[PDB]
């Protein structure tokens, strides 16, 4: 068995416990979950209007999942260096170790400062994620379905940029499942598609098209952390890693 230990061959004298730095730094670290609650970058984008968006329109959408979005290096023309360089990040890295999770997520989106416009945010649990592809931010365009617009019944909240340009969301767990998949999701069962993301967050400005131009190419960082209630389940060993300092230099 994996954890069996046939025969210890101790040489060590007892070593004093640090209590995980509690002895020194005054704080324990053994509880990985509390570390999990520190926020992490979740995504990044420049706003990019396409159609003359109506106020109804969501500016963009994304699946809301612990695993982290499929990593975005960005284009060769426009690398997102932080993923290009600072690969992945902690929370997904630990997510690598488990096959299931149940619980919530925090986000705390940061809007560009320069704009004043009021900002709404839908949550749509209804949406199924579909394939690990498109586990990512998406810029909605011309309205067709109700997907591209603000929607009624879905829970939502509206930050006022003029008051403040950073919303602090909390995403409830809502699935008719025991608990969701945690590794990268290839899909299979049509039902299985519902069984991953907590749902689908979406964001839209109330700005009219005449004003919307100011908002173009503005940065929008997103963060997240597991929101206390989160619970990973089944252990799984790690997939192979890629060393970061081993990454190539930009080269002169």
């Amino acid at each position: 068995e994996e954890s069996r230990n046939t025969t210890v061959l101790d040489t060590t004298t007892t070593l004093q416990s640090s209590g995980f730095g509690r002895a020194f730094f005054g704080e324990a670290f053994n509880d990985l979950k509390t570390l999990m609650r520190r926020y992490q970058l979740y995504g990044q984008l420049l706003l990019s209007v396409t159609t003359d968006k109506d106020i109804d329109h969501c500016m963009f959408t994304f699946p809301c999942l612990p695993q982290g979005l499929a990593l975005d290096i960005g284009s060769a023309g426009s690398p997102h260096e932080i993923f290009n360089r600072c690969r992945d990040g902690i929370i997904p890295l630990i997510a690598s170790g488990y096959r299931f999770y149940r619980g919530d997520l925090r986000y705390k989106i940061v809007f560009p400062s320069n704009v004043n416009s009021n900002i709404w945010v839908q949550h749509r649990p209804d949406r199924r994620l579909e394939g690990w592809s498109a586990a990512k931010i998406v810029n909605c365009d011309a309205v067709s379905t109700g997907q591209g617009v603000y929607n009624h019944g879905y829970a939502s909240h509206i930050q006022i940029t003029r008051v403040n340009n950073v919303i602090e969301l909390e995403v409830p767990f809502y699935n008719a499942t025991c608990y969701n998949y945690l590794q990268a999701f290839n899909a299979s069962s049509a039902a299985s598609s519902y069984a991953v993301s907590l749902g689908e967050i979406s964001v839209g400005f109330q700005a009219t098209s005449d004003d919307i131009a100011s908002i173009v190419n503005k940065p929008v960082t997103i963060y997240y952390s597991i929101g206390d209630g989160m619970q990973f389940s089944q252990w799984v060993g790690y997939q192979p890693m890629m060393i970061l300092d081993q990454l190539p230099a930009p080269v002169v």
Binding site: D126, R128, T145, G146, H152, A176
Partner: protein
């Protein structure tokens, strides 16, 4: 006002005609085992309206639901009419398997025979049977994907063909009343998949 308080109300949902001549194998209906049972109106409008059982309507506001349903059956018939009919319930039918059905395969799954003679009405109670503790909404906001179909399907075949006296009509009206079962319940609130008839107006965004 309360979810159950509404859900515990029958609405007429269907009006089967049941003639004498129907074969013992003959089907009467096979509506799905979901709250979102339909009743289309002959709206000439491009957006046809539909009747719903109250339970379906209240269900429409929620992503998920679970628990038993109920179908009161009212066989509007004189006592002299006599007949018998299965009202079975097949769990887990995909639409390809929606066909191939007969009352007999239906018998393989759970079912209830009934004998029309004296009492002319009863109430079947549809089981909730799914791999899923809840069940996703059949439809959704105008957004076709993420519109999973019903877990299972009801059936009703004429287990014994009607045998009317000559002095009474061969046809017999049957009515079907949906209602939320006592077990019935929903959970997550989302955009209702329905609109009021108050303003059945719509605007296509053709670009032409």
């Amino acid at each position: 006002m309360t979810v159950s308080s509404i859900a515990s109300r029958y609405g007429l949902i269907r009006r089967v005609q049941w003639k004498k001549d129907h074969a013992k194998g003959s089907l009467l209906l096979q509506l799905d085992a979901d709250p979102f049972v339909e009743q289309r109106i002959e709206g000439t409008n491009p957006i046809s309206l539909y009747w719903f059982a109250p339970v379906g309507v209240v269900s429409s506001m929620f992503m998920q639901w679970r628990g038993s349903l109920e179908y009161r059956f009212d066989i509007i018939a004189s006592q002299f009419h006599t007949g018998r009919l299965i009202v079975g319930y097949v769990p887990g039918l995909t639409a390809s398997l929606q066909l191939q059905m007969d009352y007999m395969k239906l018998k393989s799954s759970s079912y209830v025979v009934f004998d029309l003679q004296e009492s002319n009405s009863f109430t079947f109670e549809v089981p909730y049977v799914s791999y899923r503790p809840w069940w996703v909404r059949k439809y959704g906001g105008n957004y076709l994907p993420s519109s999973t179909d019903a877990p299972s399907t009801l059936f009703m075949y004429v287990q014994v063909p009607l045998i009317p006296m000559e002095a009474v009509s061969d046809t017999i009206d049957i009515n079907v009343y949906v209602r939320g079962g006592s077990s019935f319940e929903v959970c997550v609130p989302v955009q209702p998949s329905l609109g009021l008839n108050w303003n059945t107006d719509f605007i296509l965004r053709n670009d032409e």
